[PDB]
Structures are given as C-alpha cells and as structure tokens.
DNA sequence: CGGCGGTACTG
DNA sequence: CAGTAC
DNA sequence: GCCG
Ligand SMILES: Nc1ccn([C@H]2C[C@H](O)[C@@H](COP(=O)(O)OP(=O)(O)OP(=O)(O)O)O2)c(=O)n1
Ligand SMILES: [Mg+2]
Ligand code: NA
Ligand code: NA
Ligand code: NA
Ligand code: NA
C-alpha cells in the first residue's frame with residue numbers, strides 16, 4: 001500500500017549508492033526510512049508529517065520536501081559515476097564493497113575486465129560463472145522440488161531426519177532467491193556427522209554443482225552454502241543453503257532461518273533492550289553487556305521448544321511466518 | 327556521543 | 338584477523 | 344542516515 005513511490009524510488013537509489021560504497025550505517029538509516037515511507041498509508045504532505053514518522057528525521061524529511069516541491073533530489077545528481085560499477089562488481093557472490101572498490105581502483109569497469117584480469121577467490125569465480133543465475137529468483141514450486149530433493153536424500157539414510165524449507169519460502173513468497181533447508185532430528189543426537197553423508201549423496205546424483213562454503217574437514221560443520229541444479233531441460237543453477245542443528249536449538253534455528261533478515265535484527269535488538277540475547281542457537285536471559293553493548297556475560301539459556309516460546313519470553317504476540325517480512 | 331544482530335566460513 | 342555471508 |  002505504498003503511497004509514496006515517487007519519494008522512496010528516489011531514496012532507494014541513494015540508499016544503494018551508500019551501501020555499495022561501504023557506508024553501511026548511513027545506508028541502514030535510509031533503508032528504515034524507505035521502509036517506513038512504504039507503510040505510511042497516507043502520502044506525507046508536510047515536513048512535520050514526515051518527522052512524525054518513525055524512522056524519519058529532519059535530514060530525511062528535508063529531502064522528502066525537495067522531492068515533493070522540486071519533484072527531484074539534487075543529491076541524486078551527484079552520485080559517483082563509480083556506483084553502477086561497484087554494484088555490478090558486488091553482485092558477484094563472494095565479492096563485497098571492499099573487493100568492489102579495490103577492483104574499481106585497479107581500473108576494472110566490467111565483468112569482462114574481472115574475468116580476464118581480476119584475481120578471484122574460489123567463491124568469486126563460482127559467483128561470476130553464475131552471475132545471471134544468482135540474480136534470478138525461482139518460482140516457489142521449484143524451491144519445493146529442491147527441498148524435496150534434499151529431504152529425500154537425507155531421509156534415505158535416516159527417515160527420522162526432519163527437513164524444512166525456511167527463508168522467503170516459509171514466509172509464503174511466490175518466488176525465492178535461493179532455498180534454505182533446515183535439518184534436525186527429534187532424538188537430539190542423530191543429527192551429528194550427517195553433512196558428510198548428505199552432501200556425498202547429493203553429489204552422487206549430480207544435484208550439487210558447486211560449493212561456496214562447506215567446512216567438511218570439521219565434524220562440527222553447521223552450514224553448507226552451495227549451488228544445485230535439477231535434472232532435465234530448461235533448468236538453471238540455483239543457490240542452496242543447508243543448516244543442520246541440534247533438536248534443542250530447533251525453534252531458534254527455525255525462527256532465524258525463516259527471517260526475514262530485518263525481522264531477525266529488530267527481534268534481536270529488542271531482546272538486547274530486555275537484557276536478553278537471541279541467536280540461531282538460543283534465547284538467553286540475564287546477559288551481561290558493557291557500555292558499548294558488548295556481551296561481557298553469557299547469562300543463561302531459556303527453554304524454547306517452539307517459536308511461540310521465543311515471542312512469549314520476549315513479551316511479544318506471536319507472528320506467522322508470512323507476517324515476518326519485516 | 328555512539329550503537330545500529332548475532333552468528334559461521336575463508337585464507 | 339578482515340571480508341563476506343546467512 | 345535515525346535515535347536514545
Ligand atoms: N543478513 C541476514 C541474512 C539472512 N538472515 C536469515 C534470515 C533469512 O530469512 C535467512 C535466509 O537468508 P536468505 O538470504 O535466503 O533470505 P530469504 O530467503 O529471506 O530471501 P530470499 O528470497 O532472497 O532467499 O537467513 C539473517 O538473519 N541475516
Ligand atoms: Mg532464501
Ligand atoms: Na518519527
Ligand atoms: Na557480492
Ligand atoms: Na539463503
Ligand atoms: Na570445504
């Protein structure tokens with residue numbers, strides 16, 4: 001119900017600019033403001049009406065006026081010419097703002113320049129090889145097929161293994177950027193040392209095509225981030241993320257993996273205000289932090305058998321996954 | 327003034 | 338560790 | 344960038 005497209009559309013450009021240039025916190029600031037402007041049913045009409053909105057300050061409001069009066073944003077006319085290129089570069093999986101700026105500094109301007117002259121990490125080479133594929137979203141139906149493929153291979157050597165697709169899929173989105181599969185076991189122990197068996201099985205059938213993050217020399221590997229592709233014609237390579245967690249950490253793992261990211265952050269920001277701490281591992285109470293919000297004391301873990309418990313313990317009304325898109 | 331989430335790999 | 342990612 |  002965004003009644004401010006002509007405002008946000010201009011700010012979103014400025015937000016991405018700051019983000020690719022590495023100005024993370026300023027970009028965060030814009031992100032929340034833009035998010036707000038898309039929830040305010042009524043189109044802001046005053047410099048005051050703006051300030052009155054959570055996530056919008058004087059600085060933000062001021063430029064909302066220039067867009068309301070001048071119909072344009074002077075700032076947008078002074079965005080470095082490097083931005084489009086930095087965004088192109090940072091869209092390579094494994095390359096971030098630091099690598100993008102370095103490459104730009106070295107004179108690179110195109111993926112052809114990267115391909116032929118840039119020094120790439122193993123991850124970046126895989127990301128460049130699937131540059132277009134990784135920017136595409138798949139229909140959820142395909143995500144289902146991928147989850148099913150992973151689940152089938154998992155339950156093959158242990159029918160007790162519980163498998164659930166999380167991320168945007170569980171939140172009910174029509175399309176998914178990748179597939180997030182959480183795996184755990186109700187007996188609280190058979191979930192150990194399975195990555196070896198599962199990944200091996202998924203490779204045997206040729207389902208996995210590339211590995212981005214897979215610390216298989218360690219028996220305590222928690223996640224696998226890779227690339228897969230279903231069989232048959234017209235198939236594209238898709239990003240696949242898999243996490244194996246202890247049953248005791250199931251709810252926190254599920255909540256985390258379901259997101260959204262912004263939802264997780266506000267949830268964790270809240271827990272911190274209540275002297276608590278939430279992670280994909282567990283919800284803790286009586287956590288000791290210093291003047292800089294740094295955890296100095298671990299506190300203790302609270303029993304959270306279900307997601308409802310997490311919300312409850314935080315003094316919050318439960319939210320269906322679909323209601324966690326922020 | 328100064329935090330803005332809390333984690334897990336890589337090299 | 339810094340960088341990048343979920 | 345916002346905000347306590
Ligand atoms: N910075 C981040 C990124 C991700 N996540 C968590 C919440 C996400 O829902 C989940 C999976 O990450 P994805 O990047 O796959 O996010 P989504 O699945 O939500 O979106 P997409 O549809 O783009 O895959 O990991 C997080 O807590 N913090
Ligand atoms: Mg996802
Ligand atoms: Na406000
Ligand atoms: Na990237
Ligand atoms: Na993901
Ligand atoms: Na590895």
Ligand code: NA
Pocket residue numbers: none
């Ligand atoms: Na400025």
